[PDB]
Amino acid sequence: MASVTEQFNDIISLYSTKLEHTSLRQDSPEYQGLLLSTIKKLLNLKTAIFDRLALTIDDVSTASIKFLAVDYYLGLLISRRQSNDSDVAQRQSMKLIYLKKSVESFINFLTLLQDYKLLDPLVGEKLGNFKDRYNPQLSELYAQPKNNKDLSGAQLKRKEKIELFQRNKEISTKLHCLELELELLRELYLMRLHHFSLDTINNIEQNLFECEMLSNFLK
């Protein structure tokens, strides 16, 4: 519906202008209220595009390429949800559900790019390391030091992080020069997905760590 592109564009704008960063309290009903309706809209859009219109990357028309990011944006929005339930257990437990759902969306997104043979092999190696795609482990994303003496383990982790970081910076700069230069459109859209897939690894790490940390306090 309406068009799908305009709808997507409005969603992304709400995200960038009001939901990515806020000056309001994140537990505020004004913030969560807009966040929730945004998500509801994006979920409706996914159904419209993927289910009802039912849309190789050669096969995708230029303006449709944007939509491969719907799960990315669901990832980003969902990780930001918070409950205001008076019940403290319920509100904390809900947070874990949000982080779980955010990560699932993020994984949907990578899996989709992989299905289109678009996935940076750096990102794909990480995606592949999940023994259970639906139960992904922070221990599968990077090598982790065995203990607090494991210098090699820690140096290996730093090596893998630095490689993520450099690659992310590289694609960010390529995306940046493309946006500013704005035939190029198609390249921009593809580069944008590229930057998203790298960003995703950071979000998946942060959410898995954050989830594990907040979970211990409920145990």
Q: Which does 54 bind (CB under 5 to 8 A by kind): Zn ion, a second copy, none?
A: none
Per the CB < 8 A criterion, the answer to whether 167 and 199 are in contact is: no
User: Whole-angstrom distance between the N-terminal and C-terminal Cα of the chain?
Assistant: 44
The answer to whether the Cα torsion of 163, 110, 108, 77 is positive or negative is positive
Q: Which does 151 bind (CB under 5 to 8 A by kind): a second copy, Zn ion, none?
A: a second copy
* Contact letters for Zn ion, residues 124-163 (x by CB under 5 A): ----------------------------------------
CB of 206 to Zn ion, least distance (A): 11
Helical spans, DSSP H, in 88-150: 88-115, 121-128, 138-141
Write out the residues near a second copy by the rule CB under 8 A. Answer: 26, 88-89, 92, 95, 145, 147-158, 160-162, 164-166, 168-169, 172, 199, 202, 205-206, 209-210, 213-214, 217-218
Kindly tell me which of 32 and 46 has the beta carbon lying closer to a second copy. 32
Cα torsion through 211, 143, 192, 48, rounded to 10: -50
Q: Which does 193 bind (CB under 5 to 8 A by kind): Zn ion, a second copy, none?
A: none
Distance CA 82, CA 107 (A): 21
Per the CB < 8 A criterion, the answer to whether 73 and 19 are in contact is: no
Kindly tell me which of 40 and 176 has the beta carbon lying closer to Zn ion. 176
100 binds Zn ion (CB under 5 A): yes
